[PDB]
């Protein structure tokens, strides 16, 4: 089969930048090379076909070039709505094969997270379990550290963190941290806090509650 290679799996660029995404086929594909955009929600559309032909309705800032085994998608004057994963595909010979994809993050100005904290629910407690949850919302860049402090001591066991995809309208990220304990464990401590450390601040952003006041 024909192997398609996109050697850059991810990149980051600012609004207005030129973005070049490369694709290499394992054999000549006679210019039958097509590009697709997959939005973060999973919606797929074709951009370019037959190397350089622009699909009706796709903005002109998308263009393609190449021949033989080597091809490129260019996004000129990058726009906010271009956050997506980009895939190449050869249509020369069966099986029709795709590249592995190139994920495009768009930069924005650094932004501090908005932190919210939530105690476990009555319903969960009756089940004999206890999940404490922290949301860090609308921050940039993506890297961020969350620490849980129980009565002042760091707790790492039982912590699970999930980042959102980049927000399509404002390019920020969000993440949830979930600390799940047995109800027994929960009950034997009072102070619960999550601390967010991010490059936008020299000191952590903190939210806390006390079990006996909740």
């Amino acid at each position: 089969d024909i192997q398609m290679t996109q050697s850059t799996s991810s990149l980051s660029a600012s609004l207005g930048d030129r973005v070049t995404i490369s694709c290499r086929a394992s054999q000549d594909i006679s210019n039958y090379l097509n590009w697709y955009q997959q939005k973060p929600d999973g919606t797929v559309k074709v951009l370019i076909y037959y190397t350089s032909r622009l699909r009706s309705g796709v903005p002109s800032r998308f263009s393609g070039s190449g021949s033989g085994t080597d091809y490129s998608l260019t996004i000129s004057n990058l726009e906010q709505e271009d956050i997506a994963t980009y895939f190449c595909q050869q249509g020369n010979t069966l099986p029709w094969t795709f590249g592995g994809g190139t994920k495009l993050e768009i930069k924005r100005a650094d932004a501090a997270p908005t932190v919210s904290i939530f105690p476990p629910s009555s319903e969960q407690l009756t089940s004999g379990g206890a999940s404490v949850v922290c949301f860090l919302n609308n921050f940039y860049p993506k890297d961020i550290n969350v620490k849980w402090k129980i009565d002042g001591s760091e707790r790492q066991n039982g912590v699970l963190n999930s980042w959102t995809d980049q927000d399509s309208k404002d390019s920020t990220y969000s993440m949830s941290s979930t600390l799940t304990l047995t109800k027994d464990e929960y009950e034997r401590h009072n102070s619960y806090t999550c601390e967010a450390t991010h490059k936008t601040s020299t000191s952590p952003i903190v939210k806390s509650f006390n079990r006996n006041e909740c």
Partner: protein, 226 residues
Amino acid sequence: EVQLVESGGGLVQPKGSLKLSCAASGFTFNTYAMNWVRQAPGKGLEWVARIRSKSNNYATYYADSVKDRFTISRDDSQSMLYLQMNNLKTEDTAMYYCVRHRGAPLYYGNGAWFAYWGQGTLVTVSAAKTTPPSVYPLAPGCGDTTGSSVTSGCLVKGYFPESVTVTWNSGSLSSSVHTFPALLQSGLYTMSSSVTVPSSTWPSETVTCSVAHPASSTTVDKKLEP
């Protein structure tokens, strides 16, 4: 205009079977070739199968990985595409997309490409059983309050397979919401969702999350209370 609505996706055990469907509309179905394309989670796209039009005697073609296990078919009278999947394997786990082939090659070139794509139907091939989620609300405690806004949430815990959908106020309050991708913890998934609203409009005024998990026919609503 062009709509391709996939259905039939679900959990199935290894060596099991499942039939997917795709309801097409907004174009002349019977003059186009159709495809299925799939995407294993976190991976690239893989072409699965092609069925040509009646004018080409409905010739079918398959990727070698699915050849002899999968059968692509169509019902032109109902504008439906089907994928019958037999002897399923773990690595068939994927989102499955119904796809309309490019049209006239004299205009669009001989090379194959895929002009319109459905939103997908998720197929999970696993030995693990269906498990409905436990849904729990997330409201602020008594201690402290910001004047401008408040953030509420729903925690969706210990389900299988993917996925679930969370909506707030029957869809009304939207994109003030964040959906946190599900994580697999010890054979079971957990995700959460948040909404942010003006602080005056809550709690005076109701806020509710509806959690659907089609795979276990469950739907749970939580009205959020102080």
